[PDB]
Amino acid sequence: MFKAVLFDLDGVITDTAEYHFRAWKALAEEIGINGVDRQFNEQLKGVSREDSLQKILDLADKKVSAEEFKELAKRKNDNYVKMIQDVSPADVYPGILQLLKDLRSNKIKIALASASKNGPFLLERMNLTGYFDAIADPAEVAASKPAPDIFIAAAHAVGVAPSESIGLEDSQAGIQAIKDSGALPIGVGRPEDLGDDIVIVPDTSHYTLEFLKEVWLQK
Ligand SMILES: [Mg+2]
């Protein structure tokens, strides 16, 4: 049976995308740029902070100095850190707390494999820290998803090989990272988005220990 579960944060345990979006929208409003809405925000997902800011600036064909670019980028982050102060256990996705409990009671290791620079803060605000055996530090990892490095790091940190593990992800890049680490992916969302070759559940309430076991036995 699998020995560990490697969780992404955004789209699996909670929604951080909301708070990035709010941070960019508030930034854009502050400097008088219109059009940073939830649809436009699709162009900012999975994209570097530099690239995102550049796209926002283009909406008003606004030009900045290097010093101003740096300040705006810092301001987005300040915005983000302010907006996540509101996170609480009420923000945990359905099924996830029960899944963590059941994993822990079955002595299955639990690790976070997230690019979030605020992972430990977020898990603490959601009162989940006690379930996690490790959090992979994205600062100590060389390449982002779809590279497998973060999932490898998360497995190793709990003393397992990725091939002994299940990875939970909602994104294409994350699923590919899990695949290339050697872990078994189980996606959450739509096969239209994530592919027909993996097991996908429509929402996180379907991530139960019983279901993970059945998927493992059937792989
Ligand atoms: Mg995700």
Alpha-carbon distance of 102 to 209, in angstroms, equals 7
Write out the residues surrounding ion ligand 1, Cβ under 5 A: 8, 10-11, 170-171
> Determination technique for this PDB entry?
X-ray
61: left (phi over 0), alpha (psi -120 to 50) or beta: left
Alpha-carbon distance of 127 to 176, in angstroms, equals 29
Any long-range contacts for 26-32 (C-beta under 8 Å, 24+ apart)? Answer: 26/79, 26/83, 27/56, 27/72, 27/75, 27/76, 27/79, 28/56, 28/59, 30/75, 31/62, 31/72, 32/60
In this structure, what token pair is assigned to residue 62? Answer: 């606004």
| Cα 34 to ligand 1 centre (Å) | 28
Alpha-carbon distance of 195 to 99, in angstroms, equals 24
CATH topology (fold) of 16-85? DNA polymerase; domain 1 (1.10.150)
The answer to whether 10 is a known ligand-binding residue is yes
| Cα 105 to ligand 1 centre (Å) | 25
| Cα 75 to ligand 1 centre (Å) | 24
The answer to whether 116 is a known ligand-binding residue is yes
The answer to whether 170 is a known ligand-binding residue is yes
| Cα 48 to ligand 1 centre (Å) | 16
The answer to whether 47 is a known ligand-binding residue is yes
Q: Is 10 a catalytic residue?
A: yes
Cβ distance 60 to 83 under 8 Å?
Answer: no
Report helix, strand or coil for 36: coil
